[PDB]
Every structure is written in C-alpha cells, then in structure tokens.
C-alpha cells in the first residue's frame, strides 16, 4: 500500500495473508469471511502471462498477523488450503474480469481477538454505501511505493498497512484507461485535482476493500484489490473487484453441497 500507514494491531482480523510455501514468498492479501472460508483476488493464484498457477499444495494462508517478518506464535494461526475456487467467467487473457477467488481452509480455525471474519456487502447496504465519493478501506503488505527499480520486489512494509480510498464514478474509471471496464469491478482513489492521495500496489491484490455501515457499525468487504496501471500514478485509479455484484457467485459456491 502506497501512502499507507502502520495498522493498529487488531485492525483487520479478517485480513489473511496468502503466503507461498517454497520458495518462502509473500503472494497476496486475502479476506476471512467465516471460520473456514477466505476470499481473494482470483489472479493471485492463476495468471498465465506470469506463468502463475498455484494450487492448494503450493501455498498456505496465515491469519491474525501484523508483522510480515517474524512468526507470531501468540496470535498467528497458519492454515493449509483444502480446495481452491477461481471464477469461471474469469477473463485474464484480456482484462481481469471476475477477478475473485474462494479458498476453503483444510481445518476450521478458532477465532481469537485477532482472527475475526468480515461481512459481505448487503443487497441494500451495497446501494446505501457504494456511491462515488464515499471512502473505503484497503489493507495489505504490498509495495510501499512505485519504483523505476523494476526487476526488484522486496519493497514492502514490515507491519500491515492501511489506506482509506474514495470511490470514483464509472465514467472517469473507464475514461482513465485503455483497458476495458466491466460492471464486475470498480475503481477507487483520489482525483489529481485533489489534495490527498494513495493507492494499493503490487503484492496487495487479494486484500479487502472494506467499508463500515453507519446503520450497524459493521465492516463489509465491498471489493478485492485486483489491478491498476502502475501505482498511485497521477491520472489513473486503482481497480478492485466489485464483491457485491459477485456475491451471487460466492453463494452459488459455498452452499454447494445440497443442490
């Protein structure tokens, strides 16, 4: 996260960290939505242009953290993935459409004051809240900033980062790009003419874009960090997955065994 800020330990319990087993390497952020389901950006697992296609074995998530460095026995719980769920109509060949994925933990975890789940946007809360102008919250351990020093990754913070970004209106979003947009994704950030700034960056993806409902002091994950051209550049905005609009799919896949 660019223009980020050290989170306050216990600020994003539902914040998972998709970590790769070997070579030990940080892949993406994620989202805990229950005690056995975690939600992330579909491309964090699969993305052929970068020869990416991980599987349950290749990695393991880590919930209830803060320091990306050291192991935190006191609060850190490490769990292995049972089955992996990428979206069918997921389009990477062209523009990362339906860039969302579901992960089913091999064993249900015990929620502590640090591993609590998040809520999914509501059919009504979606409308009441998803309006251009409103600010959401993005968290992750992604690139601290953009670097000409390409060919190098390790540029992340030490602790979890948090940045609150306002929603941009459809026109602009589409306008600020030569990449085709879809109702299945939204863009957030600060307009150049504005003062503040910030953005999520690489190795941030999977992470949540939450908002807190004033009608019930609860946090709903409106979006997933998905893509963007550069990072916190001036003129382009960061694109997240429109989680609510996809909630139809989600359901369709969790409540699977039965029908």
């Amino acid at each position: 996260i660019v223009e980020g800020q050290d989170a306050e330990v216990g600020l994003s319990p539902w914040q998972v960290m998709l970590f790769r087993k070997s070579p030990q390497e940080l892949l993406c952020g994620a989202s805990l939505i229950s005690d056995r389901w975690v939600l992330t950006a579909a491309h964090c697992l699969l993305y052929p242009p970068w020869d990416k296609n991980f599987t349950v074995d290749d990695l393991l998530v880590r919930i209830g953290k803060h320091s990306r460095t050291r192991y935190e026995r006191k609060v850190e719980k490490i769990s292995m993935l049972d089955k992996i769920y990428i979206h069918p109509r997921y389009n990477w060949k062209e523009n990362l459409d339906r860039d969302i994925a579901l992960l089913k933990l091999k064993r249900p975890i015990e929620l502590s004051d640090y591993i609590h789940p998040v809520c999914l946007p509501d059919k009504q809360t979606a409308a009441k809240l998803l309006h251009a102008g409103f600010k959401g919250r993005v968290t992750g351990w992604g690139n601290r900033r953009e670097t000409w020093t390409t060919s190098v990754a390790e540029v992340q913070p030490s602790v979890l980062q948090v940045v609150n970004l306002p929603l941009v209106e459809r026109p602009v979003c589409k306008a600020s790009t030569r990449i085709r947009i879809t109702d299945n994704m939204f863009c957030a950030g600060y307009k150049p003419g504005e003062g503040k700034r910030g953005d999520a960056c690489e190795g941030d993806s999977g992470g949540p874009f939450v908002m807190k409902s004033p009608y019930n002091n609860r946090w709903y994950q409106m979006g997933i960090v998905s893509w963007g051209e550069g990072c916190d550049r001036d003129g382009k905005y960061g694109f997240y997955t429109h989680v609510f609009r996809l909630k139809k799919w989600i359901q369709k896949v969790i409540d699977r065994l039965g029908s």
Binding site: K21, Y71, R73, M80, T149, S151
Partner: protein
C-alpha cells in the same frame, strides 16, 4: 488548473546536474544497470532476516527513505523523459507515413538522458546511506546485548540446538503424518516448521542470541501446538532426526523404528507438560 505540487524530494542528487553532458548511449545503458544493481543490493540489506526486530525499525525506516528518495528522482526523470519522447515520436510520424515502428509504453521506455554528474551523485548517496545504516546498527547492538551477533563458533552452537530440536519435531511429523486420524495436524506442524526454519536451502541465520531464544520457543510451541490439537501427549524426550541415521527412503528400518519409539513416547507420556507449554492455550 495546470499547476501541480507534490515535491516529495529527499534525494541527494543536485538539481542543476541533469543539465550536464549526456552519457554516450552505448556506455549509458550500462551505467543504468549499475544503478539498478545498487538499489537491488541496498534493499536486500533490509530484507535481511537478522533485522526483523522491533528495535531496528527506526533505523530501517531511515535507510528505506534514503533509498526511495533516490529512486523517486530517477522515476521523475523517466516520467519526464517519456513526455518528451512521445512528442518527438509524433513529429516522427508526421514525416513517415510508414508507422512500421510502434510507440513504447512507459513501462518499455528506458532513461535516455542521464549525465554522469547525476550517476555519481546517486551512488554517492546510496553508497552513503548504507554506510549510515551499518552505523545505526552497530550502535543499536552495543546497547542490546542479545542482539550483538554470534561468532562462527557461537552461531554454530545455537544453530545446532535449533536444528536438532527442529529435526526433533520432524520425528513427530513423520510419526503422525501417516496416522490417518492426525494426517492434517501433522502436515500443519511440518509446514509450520519449514515456515519458521527458513528456506530449506538457505535458512534464516541464527545470528544474535535473541533469535536463538525465540526460534526454540517458536518451534517449541509449534510442537506443543500439535499435541493440543490432537490432544495427544507430549513426551518429555523425543529422538532427533538424522537424515543419515533413518531416511524415509534410505534407512526405512531406522525410519519406522524412529516412529515406533516416538508413537510409544506419545502413548505412555503423562499430562505433566500441559502445565509448562509456551502458549497459554485457553
């Protein structure tokens, strides 16, 4: 309207420097690589495991900053250079109907205007900033005993303990990974050890004392972690794993033999340990 601020300038490269004599393109593409190679290196000094502590932060931010302020420069350089490239590309088309050639994107475009005055100044700041870091550290260590690094002997002593204990858990792992009733909890153990232990090939260095302390307790706990979850009882003494004393593929005999003893350990072990565990489960 057309005015922008954002002067996050903290680079030690003199402004009136980019007006120098541009480096011969051929000899340029190289200096660029030099540059990159410095950032690459410098950054690494941070991801150095030994520094993953709470006392080092204020001194790591220091560097990190020094490193970005310089990188910012170069970015702003490229970000500017491109805008001037686009134009001279346009005025290039309006001369050649044959757009046989295509315009390079910001991500393809490389820096083409880099004086030497610029290059030196950047390196003299990073080469600098780092020496600065080494200081910040050497200091923080003369004030935090356990943090001062070991000696080739010392480090070997710790490292050896840890590796033994670790290999002592791999006994537990192998022991129950086949136990269909505990297959998972075993796997999480094994995978959790690999996690802390470090990449197999180049594992986290057991530099200072503290690292030795923690590593044991983190491995200590991770082991108890297994028992709490399988309920099973921790034996006050389990054999260690010698890759040559009982290989799962080269010394099966001593391999299954190792597991027999271990299972028996856990089978006859008392509930005395539950009162000592590292993590206060509950």
């Amino acid at each position: 309207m057309i005015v922008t601020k954002d002067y996050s300038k903290e680079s030690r490269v003199n402004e009136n420097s980019k007006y120098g004599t541009l480096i011969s393109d051929w000899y340029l593409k190289g200096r660029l690589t030099s540059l990159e190679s410095q950032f690459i290196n410098a950054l690494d000094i941070l991801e150095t495991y030994h520094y993953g502590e709470k006392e080092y932060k204020d001194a790591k931010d220091k560097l990190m900053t020094r490193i970005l302020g310089e990188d910012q420069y170069l970015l702003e350089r490229k970000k500017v250079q491109y805008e001037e490239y686009k134009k001279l590309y346009q005025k290039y088309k309006e001369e050649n109907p044959t757009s046989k050639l295509k315009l390079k994107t910001f991500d393809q475009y490389t820096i083409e205007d880099l004086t030497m005055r610029e290059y030196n100044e950047l390196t003299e700041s990073l080469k600098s900033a780092v020496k600065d870091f080494e200081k910040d550290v050497e200091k923080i260590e003369n004030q935090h005993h356990d943090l001062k690094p070991f000696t080739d002997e010392m480090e070997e002593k710790a490292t050896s303990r840890v590796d033994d204990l670790a290999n002592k858990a791999y006994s537990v792992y192998f022991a129950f990974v086949r136990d269909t009733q505990h297959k998972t909890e075993a796997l999480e153990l094994k995978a959790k050890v690999d996690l802390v232990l470090g990449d197999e090939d180049k594992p986290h260095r057991i530099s200072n004392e503290r690292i030795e302390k923690e590593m044991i307790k983190d491995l200590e706990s991770i082991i108890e972690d297994f028992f709490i979850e399988t309920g099973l009882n921790k034996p006050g003494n389990i054999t260690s794993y010698d890759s040559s004393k009982h290989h799962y593929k080269n010394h099966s005999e001593g391999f299954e033999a190792l597991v027999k003893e271990t299972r028996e350990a856990v089978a006859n072990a008392d509930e005395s340990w539950k009162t000592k565990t590292v993590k206060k489960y509950g």
